[PDB]
Amino acid sequence: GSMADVPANLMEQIHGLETLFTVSSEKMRSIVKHFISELDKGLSKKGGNIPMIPGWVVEYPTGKETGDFLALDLGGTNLRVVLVKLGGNHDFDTTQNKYRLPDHLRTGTSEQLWSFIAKCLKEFVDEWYPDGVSEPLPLGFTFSYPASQKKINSGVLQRWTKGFDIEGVEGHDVVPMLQEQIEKLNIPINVVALINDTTGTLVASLYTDPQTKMGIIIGTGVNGAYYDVVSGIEKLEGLLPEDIGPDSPMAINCEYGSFDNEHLVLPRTKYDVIIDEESPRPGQQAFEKMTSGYYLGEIMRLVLLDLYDSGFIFKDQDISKLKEAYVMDTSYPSKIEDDPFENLEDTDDLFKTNLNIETTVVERKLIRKLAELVGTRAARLTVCGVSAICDKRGYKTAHIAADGSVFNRYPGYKEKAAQALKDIYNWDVEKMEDHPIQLVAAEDGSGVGAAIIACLTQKRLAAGKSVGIKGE
Numbered sequence: 039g040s041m042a043d044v045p046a047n048l049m050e051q052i053h054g055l056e057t058l059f060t061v062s063s064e065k066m067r068s069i070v071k072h073f074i075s076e077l078d079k080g081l082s083k084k085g086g087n088i089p090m091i092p093g094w095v096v097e098y099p100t101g102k103e104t105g106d107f108l109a110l111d112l113g114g115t116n117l118r119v120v121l122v123k124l125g126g127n128h129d130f131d132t133t134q135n136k137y138r139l140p141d142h143l144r145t146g147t148s149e150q151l152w153s154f155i156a157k158c159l160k161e162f163v164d165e166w167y168p169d170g171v172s173e174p175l176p177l178g179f180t181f182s183y184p185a186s187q188k189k190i191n192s193g194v195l196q197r198w199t200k201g202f203d204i205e206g207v208e209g210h211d212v213v214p215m216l217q218e219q220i221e222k223l224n225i226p227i228n229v230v231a232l233i234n235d236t237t238g239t240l241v242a243s244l245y246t247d248p249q250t251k252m253g254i255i256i257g258t259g260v261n262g263a264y265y266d267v268v269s270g271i272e273k274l275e276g277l278l279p280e281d282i283g284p285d286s287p288m289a290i291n292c293e294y295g296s297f298d299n300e301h302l303v304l305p306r307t308k309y310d311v312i313i314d315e316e317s318p319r320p321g322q323q324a325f326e327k328m329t330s331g332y333y334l335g336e337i338m339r340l341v342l343l344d345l346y347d348s349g350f351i352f353k354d355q356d357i358s359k360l361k362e363a364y365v366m367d368t369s370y371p372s373k374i375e376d377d378p379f380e381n382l383e384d385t386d387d388l389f390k391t392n393l394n395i396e397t398t399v400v401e402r403k404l405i406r407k408l409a410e411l412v413g414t415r416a417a418r419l420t421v422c423g424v425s426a427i428c429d430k431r432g433y434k435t436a437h438i439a440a441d442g443s444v445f446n447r448y449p450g451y452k453e454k455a456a457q458a459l460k461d462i463y464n465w466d467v468e469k470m471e472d473h474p475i476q477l478v479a480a481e482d483g484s485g486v487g488a489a490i491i492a493c494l495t496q497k498r499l500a501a502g503k504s505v506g507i508k509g510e
């Protein structure tokens with residue numbers, strides 16, 4: 039609440055940061071206008087900055103999908119392998135194992151990555167099918183990075199995101215890279231489909247919630263998927279086989295973490311500039327860099343180090359541990375917003391124990407305000423992607439299936455995101471559950487969604503129907 043004890047000199051800095059990080063309802067509406075134009079440009083013949091990548095899911099799941107499938111999920115804190123049993127009445131069951139990523143995987147080689155993944159797949163298959171199998175197990179591969187797909191079992195990596203920086207993969211088809219390592223270990227796996235995590239979120243959540251119109255991730259990254267219609271995808275004109283007609287649905291992985299790399303509308307601050315310049319891929323993922331869980335603690339770190347350098351805080355402290363980029367992950371602002379003490383004892387312990395920095399009560403109130411500003415900005419900017427897709431497609435109502443560490447775990451985040459949509463549309467509604475466009479907990483898109491997409495894909499191929507451009 040209250041700040042009576044904070045000197046005027048520091049209150050001026052807090053007021054400057056509030057100004058710098060606050061996004062007005064009108065600013066969200068103007069961002070949304072420009073976001074719609076950039077979504078449409080990405081579907082155009084000439085293309086645009088936002089990839090808008092077709093995912094070759096050309097139908098809705100009916101709920102009657104049946105059978106056992108493997109899902110391989112690259113992009114959680116761990117690698118995950120899942121055995122998914124579809125039940126045939128909108129029901130499923132799963133069991134899974136998680137595998138710790140090698141140290142420095144993100145800056146390692148392609149060969150390291152594909153060898154580690156195949157090793158984990160063989161461990162899983164040996165554990166769950168110790169007696170072997172009569173036919174190759176069908177697998178859906180969730181690759182949580184932007185990949186061009188000429189057909190559903192191909193994925194050519196466009197750019198590493200979220201800190202990744204593995205040489206030899208951007209511009210390469212990852213499905214053959216995975217397949218060669220599967221073969222080398224003689225694992226009986228049929229890679230039926232590659233999907234993005236948003237596309238899986240969309241499809242898995244539609245299997246149990248028929249009002250789903252988007253699948254979004256608000257986690258280590260930020261992105262969304264939805265279904266367009268083939269007639270609305272100009273860049274597919276002349277490329278489609280005859281069985282996929284103009285009225286067919288087509289799921290789109292927007293990769294809208296990329297939005298506004300031109301820096302024409304988002305309220306980038308000097309802290310966002312540094313994050314982008316110091317990241318592995320400068321010039322890329324502008325919207326995600328402002329919003330997602332890989333970055334929110336790094337925005338706080340850079341603000342704190344500016345306030346120190348300018349003489350305002352930590353004046354008598356050794357701040358050496360604060361100089362390490364990414365040392366403050368989003369668990370810092372999360373714990374700070376959760377601290378239930380008046381004088382922020384939990385925050386005191388966090389800075390002393392983990393950073394060796396003694397704080398005053400007034401400095402912890404400043405830090406708490408900073409965490410709140412950064413989280414609120416993230417929520418208000420992130421729902422502009424939802425508003426943009428819904429306005430573009432003419433959805434006045436929607437369940438928006440959401441997943442990811444920030445939506446699920448960041449204190450207060452679901453309430454702020456729902457308030458930001460309420461503010462965009464000027465609804466009168468009182469309770470979150472009554473919002474006409476509302477975020478709801480998703481089904482597991484990287485596990486259950488990859489399995490349903492593998493199932494739908496196999497059914498198409500058994501029927502002789504297409505799952506890629508003509509000549510694929």
Ligand SMILES: OC[C@H]1O[C@H](O)[C@H](O)[C@@H](O)[C@@H]1O
Pocket residue numbers: 113181182183184199200234235236255257258259260261262293295326
């Ligand atoms: O995991 C969430 C998102 O993170 C990044 O934005 C990735 O580029 C995107 O492929 C993924 O959907």
Ligand SMILES: [Cl-]
Pocket residue numbers: 045047048
């Ligand atoms: Cl002061």
Ligand SMILES: [Cl-]
Pocket residue numbers: 089090091092186
């Ligand atoms: Cl494309």
Ligand SMILES: [Cl-]
Pocket residue numbers: 058306307308309
């Ligand atoms: Cl600035």
Ligand SMILES: [Cl-]
Pocket residue numbers: 432433434435436
């Ligand atoms: Cl509607």
